[PDB]
Structure formats: C-alpha cells, structure tokens
Amino acid sequence: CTVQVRLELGHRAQLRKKPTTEGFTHDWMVFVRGPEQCDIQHFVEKVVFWLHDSFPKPRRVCKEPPYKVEESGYAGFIMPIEVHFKNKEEPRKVCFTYDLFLNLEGNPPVNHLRCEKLTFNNPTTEFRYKLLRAGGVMV
C-alpha cells in the first residue's frame, strides 16, 4: 500500500502598535497543522521549529498540538521546520524550509498558507493505522 497525508504550513505577521524595548516591530505566528478534520497528532511525534540564531534558544519544540511558535521580531528569515513521525522505521521525519516573511509598514498583515503532501510506501501495520486516523488516504 501507499498512503498520502496532507500537511498545512502557514504563518501570520503584523506590525505591533508599539515596538518592544528591543526594537521588535512585528508579531508573528508560524504553524504546522492538518487540513480540516485531520488530527495529525496521530502520526506526528513532534514538530521542531528552527528559528534564526539571533533568537535565544532558537530550537523550538512542540510535542503536541497546536504545533506553532508565536514570537516578536524585526525581520523575516528562512525557518527550517522538521516534522517527526511516530514511526519505527524510515522515514523518521521530513524537513521543510519555510519562508517567514513580514509585511512592510503600511501594507496588509501577512496571512500565508502552504499545503504539503507526504507519501508513505508500505508502512508497518501500526504506522498505517496512525496515518489513517490522521486522515490519510490509500493511493
């Protein structure tokens, strides 16, 4: 069998009304989630968000939903996002590279959505069940 599951990556950003003491101009939020009706927790062990080295403790882990990071900053950047699976064999994880871009002052808030598709060939019985409970479909 071959099982396909959908992931949704996305982010929001907007100008703060008041810059922080550090000079951070924006609030933003990044997320990994399933499409409507899909609880990806069935097959996702954790999501690791790799922030820019300019952030303290840049490696941010969510072991359970919502898989997200809420932060404040002054600039956008490329954010590796690793999704780890509740799997006993390969693939154990997948790494997306996510563009966390901010809006320029005067322009509308960012509200970006990105749909990803994962294909698993011949998963174990145990892992197949997890994928199907998360809204996976055989292909």
Binding site: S54, A75, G76, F77, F101, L102, N103, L104, N107
Partner: peptide, 7 residues
Amino acid sequence: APRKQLA
C-alpha cells in the same frame, strides 16, 4: 520588508 542578513 526587513529580512535578517545572510552576509
């Protein structure tokens, strides 16, 4: 929109 410099 400002972005964090790579170099």
